[PDB]
Amino acid sequence: RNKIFISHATPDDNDFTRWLALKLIGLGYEVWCDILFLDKGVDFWSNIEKVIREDTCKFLLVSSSYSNQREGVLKELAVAAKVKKQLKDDKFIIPLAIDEQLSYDDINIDIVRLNAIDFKMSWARGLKDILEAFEKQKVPKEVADASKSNLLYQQIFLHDKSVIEKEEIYDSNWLSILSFPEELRFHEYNWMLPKRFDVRELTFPAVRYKNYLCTFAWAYDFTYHLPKTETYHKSKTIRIPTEEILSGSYDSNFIRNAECKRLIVQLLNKAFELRMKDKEVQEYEMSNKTAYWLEKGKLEKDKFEKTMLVGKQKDKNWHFAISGASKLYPFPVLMISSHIFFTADGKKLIDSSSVQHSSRRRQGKNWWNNTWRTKLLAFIKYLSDDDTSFYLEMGSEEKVFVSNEPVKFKGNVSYNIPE
Amino acid sequence: RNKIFISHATPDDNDFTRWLALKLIGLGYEVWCDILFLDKGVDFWSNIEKVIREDTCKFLLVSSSYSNQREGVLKELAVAAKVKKQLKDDKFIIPLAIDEQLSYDDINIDIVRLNAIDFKMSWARGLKDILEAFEKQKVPKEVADASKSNLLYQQIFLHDKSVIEKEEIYDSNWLSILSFPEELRFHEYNWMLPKRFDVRELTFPAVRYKNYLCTFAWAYDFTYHLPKTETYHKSKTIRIPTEEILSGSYDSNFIRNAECKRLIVQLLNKAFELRMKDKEVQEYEMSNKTAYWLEKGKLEKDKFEKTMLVGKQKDKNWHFAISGASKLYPFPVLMISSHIFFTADGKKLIDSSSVQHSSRRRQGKNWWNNTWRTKLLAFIKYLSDDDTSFYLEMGSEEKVFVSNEPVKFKGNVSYNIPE
Amino acid sequence: MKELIYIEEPKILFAHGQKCTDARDGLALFGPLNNLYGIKSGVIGTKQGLKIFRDYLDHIQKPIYNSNSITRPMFPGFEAVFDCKWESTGITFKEVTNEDIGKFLYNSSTHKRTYDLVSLFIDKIISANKNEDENVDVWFVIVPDEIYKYCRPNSVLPAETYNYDAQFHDQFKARLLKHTIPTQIFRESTLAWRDFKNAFGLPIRDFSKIEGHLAWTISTAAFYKAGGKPWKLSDVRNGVCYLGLVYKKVEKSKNPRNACCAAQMFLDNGDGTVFKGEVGPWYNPKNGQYHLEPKEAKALLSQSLQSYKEQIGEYPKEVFIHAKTRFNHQEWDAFLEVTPKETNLVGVTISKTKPLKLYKTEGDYTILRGNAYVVNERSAFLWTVGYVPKIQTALSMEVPNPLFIEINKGEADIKQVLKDILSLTKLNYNACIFADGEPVTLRFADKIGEILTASTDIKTPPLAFKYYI
Amino acid sequence: MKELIYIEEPKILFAHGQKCTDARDGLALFGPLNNLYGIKSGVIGTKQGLKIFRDYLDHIQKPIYNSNSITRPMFPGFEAVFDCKWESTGITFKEVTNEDIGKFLYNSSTHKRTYDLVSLFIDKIISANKNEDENVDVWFVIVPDEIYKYCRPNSVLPAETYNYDAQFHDQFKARLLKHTIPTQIFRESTLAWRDFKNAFGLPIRDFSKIEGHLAWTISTAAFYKAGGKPWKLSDVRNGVCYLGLVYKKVEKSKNPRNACCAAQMFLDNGDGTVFKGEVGPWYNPKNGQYHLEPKEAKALLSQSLQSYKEQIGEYPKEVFIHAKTRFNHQEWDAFLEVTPKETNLVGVTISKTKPLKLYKTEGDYTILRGNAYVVNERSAFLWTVGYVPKIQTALSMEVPNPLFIEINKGEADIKQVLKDILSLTKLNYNACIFADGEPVTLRFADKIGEILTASTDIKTPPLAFKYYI
DNA sequence: CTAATAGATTAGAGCCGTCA
RNA sequence: UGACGGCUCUAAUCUAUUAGU
DNA sequence: CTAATAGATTAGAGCCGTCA
RNA sequence: UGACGGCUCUAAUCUAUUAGU
Ligand SMILES: [Mg+2]
Ligand SMILES: [Mg+2]
Numbered sequence A, B: 001r002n003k004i005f006i007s008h009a010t011p012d013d014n015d016f017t018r019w020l021a022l023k024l025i026g027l028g029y030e031v032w033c034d035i036l037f038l039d040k041g042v043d044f045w046s047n048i049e050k051v052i053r054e055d056t057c058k059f060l061l062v063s064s065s066y067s068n069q070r071e072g073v074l075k076e077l078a079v080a081a082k083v084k085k086q087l088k089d090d091k092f093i094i095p096l097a098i099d100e101q102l103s104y105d106d107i108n109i110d111i112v113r114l115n116a117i118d119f120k121m122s123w124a125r126g127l128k129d130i131l132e133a134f135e136k137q138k139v140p141k142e143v144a145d146a147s148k149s150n151l152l153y154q155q156i157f158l159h160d161k162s163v164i165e166k167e168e169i170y171d172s173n174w175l176s177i178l179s180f181p182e183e184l185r186f187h188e189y190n191w192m193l194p195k196r197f198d199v200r201e202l203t204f205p206a207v208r209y210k211n212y213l214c215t216f217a218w219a220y221d222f223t224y225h226l227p228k229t230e231t232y233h234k235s236k237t238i239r240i241p242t243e244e245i246l247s248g249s250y251d252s253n254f255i256r257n258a259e260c261k262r263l264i265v266q267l268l269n270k271a272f273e274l275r276m277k278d279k280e281v282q283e284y285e286m287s288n289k290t291a292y293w294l295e296k297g298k299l300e301k302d303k304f305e306k307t308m309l310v311g312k313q314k315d316k317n318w319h320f321a322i323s324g325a326s327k328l329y330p331f332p333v334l335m336i337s338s339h340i341f342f343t344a345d346g347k348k349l350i351d352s353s354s355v356q357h358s359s360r361r362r363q364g365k366n367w368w369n370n371t372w373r374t375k376l377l378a379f380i381k382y383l384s385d386d387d388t389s390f391y392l393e394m395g396s397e398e399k400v401f402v403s404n405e406p407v408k409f410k411g412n413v414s415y416n417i418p419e
Numbered sequence C, D: 001m002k003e004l005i006y007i008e009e010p011k012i013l014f015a016h017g018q019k020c021t022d023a024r025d026g027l028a029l030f031g032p033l034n035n036l037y038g039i040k041s042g043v044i045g046t047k048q049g050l051k052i053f054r055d056y057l058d059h060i061q062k063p064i065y066n067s068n069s070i071t072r073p074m075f076p077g078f079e080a081v082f083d084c085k086w087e088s089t090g091i092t093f094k095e096v097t098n099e100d101i102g103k104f105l106y107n108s109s110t111h112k113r114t115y116d117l118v119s120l121f122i123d124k125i126i127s128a129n130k131n132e133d134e135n136v137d138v139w140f141v142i143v144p145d146e147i148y149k150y151c152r153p154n155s156v157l158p159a160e161t162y163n164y165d166a167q168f169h170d171q172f173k174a175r176l177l178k179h180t181i182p183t184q185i186f187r188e189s190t191l192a193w194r195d196f197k198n199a200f201g202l203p204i205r206d207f208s209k210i211e212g213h214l215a216w217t218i219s220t221a222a223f224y225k226a227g228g229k230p231w232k233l234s235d236v237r238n239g240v241c242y243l244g245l246v247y248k249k250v251e252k253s254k255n256p257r258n259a260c261c262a263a264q265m266f267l268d269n270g271d272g273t274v275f276k277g278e279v280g281p282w283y284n285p286k287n288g289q290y291h292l293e294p295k296e297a298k299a300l301l302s303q304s305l306q307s308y309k310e311q312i313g314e315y316p317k318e319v320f321i322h323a324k325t326r327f328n329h330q331e332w333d334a335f336l337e338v339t340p341k342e343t344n345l346v347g348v349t350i351s352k353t354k355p356l357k358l359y360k361t362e363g364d365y366t367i368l369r370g371n372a373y374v375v376n377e378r379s380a381f382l383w384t385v386g387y388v389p390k391i392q393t394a395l396s397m398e399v400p401n402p403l404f405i406e407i408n409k410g411e412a413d414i415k416q417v418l419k420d421i422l423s424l425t426k427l428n429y430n431a432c433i434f435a436d437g438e439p440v441t442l443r444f445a446d447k448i449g450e451i452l453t454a455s456t457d458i459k460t461p462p463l464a465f466k467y468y469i
Numbered sequence E, G: 001c002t003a004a005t006a007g008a009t010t011a012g013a014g015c016c017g018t019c020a
Numbered sequence F, H: 001u002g003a004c005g006g007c008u009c010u011a012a013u014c015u016a017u018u019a020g021u
Helices: A014-026 A046-054 A071-087 A123-136 A147-157 A257-277 A353-363 A369-382 B014-026 B045-054 B071-087 B123-136 B147-157 B243-247 B257-278 B353-366 B369-383 C023-029 C047-059 C078-082 C098-104 C110-130 C168-174 C211-224 C294-311 C329-334 C414-423 C444-452 D023-029 D047-059 D078-082 D098-103 D110-130 D145-149 D168-174 D211-225 D294-311 D329-338 D416-423 D444-451
Strands: A164-171 A183-188 A207-209 A212-215 A237-241 A282-285 A290-293 A310-313 A316-322 A324-327 A333-336 A339-343 A389-393 A399-403 A408-414 B004-007 B058-063 B093-097 B164-171 B174-176 B183-187 B207-209 B212-215 B237-241 B282-285 B290-293 B310-313 B316-327 B333-343 B389-393 B399-403 B409-414 C041-045 C092-095 C138-143 C183-187 C246-249 C258-268 C272-278 C318-323 C344-351 C380-382 C403-409 D004-006 D041-044 D092-094 D138-143 D183-187 D240-247 D258-267 D273-284 D318-323 D344-351 D371-376 D379-382 D403-407
Touching (some): A014 A123, A014 A147, A014 C023, A123 C078, A183 A257, A257 A324, A290 A339, A310 A353, A316 A369, A339 A353, B004 B014, B004 B071, B014 B123, B014 D023, B045 B071, B058 B071, B071 B093, B123 D078, B183 B257, B237 B243, B243 B257, B257 B316, B290 B333, B310 B353, B316 B353, B316 B369, B333 B353, B409 D004, B409 D371, C023 C078, C041 C047, C047 C092, C078 C211, C092 C110, C098 C110, C110 C168, C168 C183, C168 C444, C258 C294, C258 C444, C272 C444, C294 C318, C318 C414, C344 C414, C380 C414, D023 D078, D041 D047, D041 D110, D047 D138, D078 D211, D092 D110, D110 D168, D138 D145, D168 D183, D168 D444, D183 D211, D240 D294, D240 D444, D258 D294, D273 D444, D294 D329, D344 D416, D379 D416, D403 D416
Parallel strands (some): B004 B058, B058 B093, C041 C092, C041 C138, C318 C344, D138 D183, D240 D318, D318 D344
Antiparallel strands (some): A183 A212, A183 A237, A282 A290, A290 A316, A316 A339, B164 B409, B174 B333, B183 B212, B183 B237, B207 B212, B290 B316, B310 B316, B316 B333, B389 B399, C246 C258, C380 C403, D004 D371, D240 D258, D258 D273, D344 D403
C-alpha cells in the first residue's frame, strides 16, 4: 500500500515532526501528518480511518507526554491494533521515546516487554535505527527524488508566509524646496567693506568671494553695519539667475557651476540656522552639527497636536531636537535629523557624554516607527508658517519656501502586519 | 542459553571465524566454535547436537564458495531448522555473506531469501550490525571486560609456545690457535741490514721495527736472503717471551705492549699467507682481503667426504672460497669467513666485478646453514695435516698448530621445532 | 510622488543541491556541502578555563531552545546539523599557569605586556605544531577576563616596539601567518556567563533567551575554521569577476600611511565558488590620500587578472571593483592599460552617509529589506537592513539607514549592480545570520587589513580567510 | 667456548591495556590507542598518478590474501583495524603538466634538473596549502618512473644554490621543513607494478604473495604520519633516557664537516612514551674525527636534559648514550661537566661488522632470535635477526650476523643493557615488521641526519617524526 | 609657507541593545 | 623512494716504525 | 710536511632476494 | 574577541576665496 503513518503530539512538536517527515520523504518513505493536505473542506476524521484500514502499509507512533492519555491517540492506537491483528503483523507499532522527563517508572503498561529507541542525546542514531528497520522489514519506497522535498518546501513551508502586493505610502524626512529667488547677486564692494569685517555675522547671509560679496539680499541691503555703502553704482554687480545655476547651464570663468551650487547650499544652511534661531528654540551643540530643542513649559502641556514632544523618564526629562542639512542631489531638499536630549528639570541639560549616551540608548527601546514619525511631523508642523510653507529669510522680499510635508514615496510590496 | 555457535569452512575460513569469535568474546559474549577445542575421537556430533538443542540461544552460519554445496553445511542447516521448528523461533539462523563472487544463481537453496549480514563494505560495519542485532535479540551478557578473551588468548593461542629448557650445541668459525713459541726476537742489524729488500718476501715471517727485525725466528735462519748475518753477536738481540705479552705482564720503555701485540698479529697473518702459498692454492684479489680457492679437479671428483668444492652452474663454473683473520679478542682465535667465486671454463676468472657479484648472489640462494657449515668445515679439514691440526711455520723449527674443529657454544633454551 | 522598486531575496545552495533562503533552515534541513570526519580540538589556557570550556562543549550536544521560536530558528545539535563529530573526549590540552599570566601583567606598559603575553601564548602553539605528534584542527584560546579588559588600544592608569598594534587579537592573528595555524579566541565571560556575576545577583550578559543563536554562531565558526563549506551561492554570473577595497590607517609605522586590501569572488570551472583574497598591502606615503599611484594600481589589476587566468585560462569579461572611495582619472588610466581589450571595468562605490529614513503610515514595523529608489542611471538606494516576512522581525532597531550605489566609472545596468550587491550579503561565515547589512567583499578586506597592519613586513602572505577571521 | 643465555621477548601495550608480541596481531585483535576520526589526502602528479592512486585506494576494499598466515599475516582491512576512514573521495588533485617535466630534461646537469623537479612539485604543494580552504593531513606524490630512471648519476649521452644534494627524495623532504606539511613520496611503479613487465612475460617486481605486507606497511605509515599511535612499550621503567648519536658527512662545503644528529626517548609520567628526534646539527670542522668538541658535547647533553626536565620536572638518574663508535676522554669529561651528581652516565657501543656466524650442528634452520653470548663483564653478543617461534620463519635467509654490544665508559650491567636494546626494536613506525636489526634510537637518527643535510638554510628544525619519515 | 571661512569626503574609537 | 635482510667495490682517519728536514 | 709497511676504526654507494 | 545593529565624541585630506610672508 506504500503509505506509512506517523503520529505525534499535534501541535506541540511541529518542528521535530516536520523535520522527520521531510527527512523520511527525501529518502523515499512517505509520511502522513497534518502538514500534508492543508484543507478542511473535506471530512478531517474519516479520511484517517479509511487510509489506515485501506492503503497503509507500515504504522508508526511517537511517544510523548502530550500524546499520553489522549482520546485521539488512543483511538488511533486501537485502530492500528485492530489492523495489526487482521494482518497478523508482529511489529506494527513502534513507539519512539523523545522526552527526557518520561521516567521508566511511569511507562505505559501496554508496552513493557518491547525495547524502546532513545532520542534524548542524538537523533542521528534513532534515524539510522529507523532506516535499518524500514530496509529490513521490506518497507515499500516511492520514487527516489529530491523534487518531492523541494516541492513540499516550496508549497507548504511558505504557505502563509508569502509577501502580498498592496499599496503603501512612505513618509520621509526630505522637505522639498518649492521656490527660489529669481537671481543670484555678487555685489562688488571695492574695499568698501573692512578687510576683517567678518561678513558671516551680519543680519543677512553673506559669503566672501574675490573682491565682491555674494548675497541674496538687495544691492543696498544690510547697510546698517556698512555706513560707506551708498556711494556705489548699482550696475557694478553680476546677476546670475538661479534657475540656470540649478540647471547645469551657467559656467563662466568668473565662477563655475559647482562652486555656485555650493555657495547656494551654504547660503540656504545659514538662512535655515537664522530662521530656527528666530523661532525662539534653544539649541544643543554636537561635534559637527547643531540641534534645536524645546524647553519645558513653553509648549502647552508638553503636547502638540495630540502628540508629545517633551516627556519624563524617572529623574530625567527628555526633549526632542532636530538638525538641518541642505542638498541639491537629486533635487533641492532639506534633510531633518531625529535627536533626543535630556534635562534634569526641563530647563538645564546634563553636561556629560556618558550620561547623555546612556539616557539616549535607554529610551529607544520603547519608541518605534510610529513614535518617531508622529513626533517629527508634529515638530515640522509646529515650525510651520501659514499652512504648508515654511520660508527662510534671505532679504527684504526674497524668500525660499520649504514645504512642511516631506516627500512621500509609494511601494507595491508590503507585508500584512499580523500584529 | 548464553551461547552462540558459529559454523564455518574448516580450514578455509579459520581466519575470519577466529577474528569474529575473539572480537565477540572481548566484549564479554560467550562464543562456542569447533576450532576452539581439539577434542576428537570421542562422540563429537552428539555433544554438538546436544549443545545446539539445549543451551544455544543464537546460531549463525557463514557462507563461502567452499561452504556452498557441502555435506557439513547442509547437515548443520538441517539441525538448525529442526531446532527452530522445536522452539518455534523465527530468528535463530542468520547467514554471514562473505563471498562477493558467489552469485545468487549458485547459492544454497536453503538460504536464498534469508537476511544475510553484509561484510563486503567493511568488516567493522558487519561487526557493529551483529552487535546491534544481538542487543535487539537480548543476548545475556555481563559487565564489559576482556578478561575472558585475554585468558582464552593466553591458554589457547600460546599454549605450546612457552619457554622450554632444552640443551643445544652450536658450531662456529672461530678456530683456536693452540701452539705458541718460546720468545720473540729483535735482530739488531745497526746499519747492517738491507733497507729496500721487501722483507715480506722471505721464506719466514718478519715484521720490522726501527732498524731491528721482530720475529720468532732464530738469527741463523733466513740467512740466504741476508748475507751479512754471520758477523754478528748474539748479545745484540732483545729476547721477549710470549705468554706474558699475551697476558699483558710486559711494561718496558723499549716497546709498548700494544705495539708488540700488533707485531704478533702481523707475524701470524704473514705466516698464514706464506703457508697457504706453500699449499699451491689459487689466489683471488678482492678489495682489501685475499681469498683462497682450488682449481677445477684439484681433488678426486671435486669432492672431499661428500662435500663439493668445485662445481658447474648453467654454463659457468664456481669454486668455494674462504678467508681468515688473526684477532686476539676475547681469546686467541683465527676467525674464518666464507665467499664464492666463478670461472668461465674451470681455470680462468671473469674480469668483471658486476658479473662476479651477480653470480654469487644467484648461487647463494640455494645454500642453507648446513651447506655453508659442511663446506667450511670440509675445506678447513683439507688444511689439517695428520690427525687434528695444521702448522704455520714461524721459525727454524717452530710450528703453530691451528685446530680443525670449530669452537663450540652451549645453550639452555630452544624450541620444539614442530616441523 | 516618486517610485520605489523591489529586488527579490536571493537563495543560497546547500547540500543535496537544495536551495533555501535562510542559512539556519538550510543547515538544519539539508546540511553542509562537504563532509568533515570530526573536529580534533585543542585547548590552550588555564585549568579553570579548560573546565568551563569542557562544560560548555558538553552543554551544546543536546538540543537547546530559544525563547521565541518563530523569530529565531532553533539549534537542535551539532551532529544533527553539521554532519561531523565534536565532543570533549578528543580534546587536547596545553596548560598556561595562572602565575605566569599574573606576572606578565605587571609591567604597567600596555605595549610590552601585550608583547610578552602574545609571545607566551604563541610559543606553545608553535612548539606543539612542530615537535608534537597529535593532529589539531582548531586551537581554541581561552583568554581570561582579567587580561582581556586591558588588551585595548587606549589604556590609561586610573626599539621595535612602536611598529606593532596594541591589541592581543590582531597581534595573535598576525604573528601566526608564517606557521598557518587556525585559531579561535574565547572569553571566560562568554562561556560561563551564569557563573560570572555583578554587584547584584544577575549575570553580566543575559543569554537566557539568546542561547540557541549563541550556539549557532559558535558552532558555525568551529565548523568553518576546521575546513568546512557551510553554504554557497545559488546562482553566480559566469565570466564576471568581482573585487573589494578597504583602506586602513597604520599605527605610526615610521610614518602615517594607508594600505589597500582586496577579497574577490567568482564562479570557477566545476560550478564552484572561489572566495579568496588578494593579499599584499599597497601603500602611498601621502597622509590622508586614499588613492593608488599608477604603478600600484597596474600591479593590483595585473595580479588579479593573472590569478583568474591561471585558475581558468580565459580572461574575465566583466570586472567589478567595489570600493568605499572614488577613483580618480589617474588610477583609472592606470587601469585599462593592462586590462584586455575584450574586458569591461566597472567602478562601484558604496556608502551609508546620506540620511533618507522612510517611515510607514499608521504602522509599528519598519520598511522592508529589498527596496531601491533608483535616482538616475548611475545612482540608487538599497535597504539591506529591514523587516523580513519570513522571520517576522526587523534586522535593526529604530529605522534602518539605507545604502548608496554609484557607478563612478564604467557602464552597466544599475538594477543588475544592485542585485549583485544584494547577493554578496549572504556569505558571512563568521556568524549564522539571515542576511548581512554590508557586502562581504568590502568587509573581509577590512578583516584582512586590520590584521596585516598589526605586524611588521611579511612576505607572501596567505590568501585563505580562516587564518585571519 | 662459553655458555649462551636467553633474553626473552618484549611486550607492547595496545588499546584496552592489553599486551602482545607482534604488532600485526595486536592491532588486528584489540585496536589502536588513538582515535583519529579521518584522513584527508592530496595527490600531485600527472593524471596517470591520480588514476593509479585512486585504484590503489579502492584496492584495499577488495580482500587481500597472503600466501601463508603464520609466516606473513594478512590485512583485515583499514577501518576494521584502525578505527578511522581513508577513502578515495577526499583526494585533492594538483595536476603537473607533462610538458613541464619534459621541457626540464635539457640542462644535462643532475643538480639543476633535480632542483627544478623538486621545485615543480613543492611549489604546487605550498600554494595549495596556502591558498585553498580545504583541510589536509598527508600529501602524497606520484613521481613519473622516467624521472627516477633518468636520475641515475652514472648516465652518459649515447654558489648560493650550489649547496644542494643530487637526490629528489632527500631534497624534496628538506625544503618542506619550514612549512610543517607531512609528505609521502610514492614511485608510480610500486603502486602499479602489474602493468610494468620486462621481455620475459613476467612483472619486473613480484608482489603476488607479499601484497598484504605492502598494504600493512603503507597503511601503518600513513596512519602514523597523520597523528596516530598504533602501539606502545610497556616494560619501560622511570628515570631512564636514551640517546643515539649518528655522524655523517655533509660535504657540499669548504670542509667535510662531520655533523652530528641525535634522538631521545624516555617516559612522560602519563604512562606514555616520548619517541622524538633531537636535532640541532652540531658540526665539527675536523675531518675523520667522529668525536664532538667539548662545547658541542655540553650543548647536546644540556639540550637533551633540559627537554627531559621540561617534560617531567626532574633530571634522569640514568642516561644511555648509544653510538655506533667509541668515545674519548675529553668528550666524556665534557659530558660529566654539565651532568649533575646523582646522574649516572653510561656509554654503549654497538657494532655488526664482526665476523662470527653460528652454524647449527643438528638442523638446517637458523639460530634462535633472542640468544646471547656474554663475553665479559663489559661485553656481550646479541642476536636480533633469525628464527622466532611465534612466526616460525627466519628473519634473514642466510646465516645471520649478531650484534657486538659493548660498554665503553661508565658502569652498567651487561644483561639489562642488552635487554633494553632488544626492547627498543619494537617501535619502528616506518615499517610493519616483527623486528629490526638495530635499536631505533640509532636508526631514525640516520634518517633525521640524511634529510637535513641536503639544505643548510634551516634554523630550529622540527622534532616530530612525521615530517622526516 | 603660515592662518582663518565653508562644503564634501574618509578612517578610528567607545558605549548600548538584543525577550516579554 | 613500501620494507627488511645479506653481500660487493671504494676513501678517509688514527696508531706505530722507517726514509725524503 | 711528504712517501711507503702494517693493524684497527669509520663512512659512502651499488646490487640482489622475499614463493614455490 | 560568539554575532549583528544603532548612536555619540573626536582627525585628517581635498576644493574654492581671502590674508600676514
Ligand atoms: Mg571569528
Ligand atoms: Mg618512509
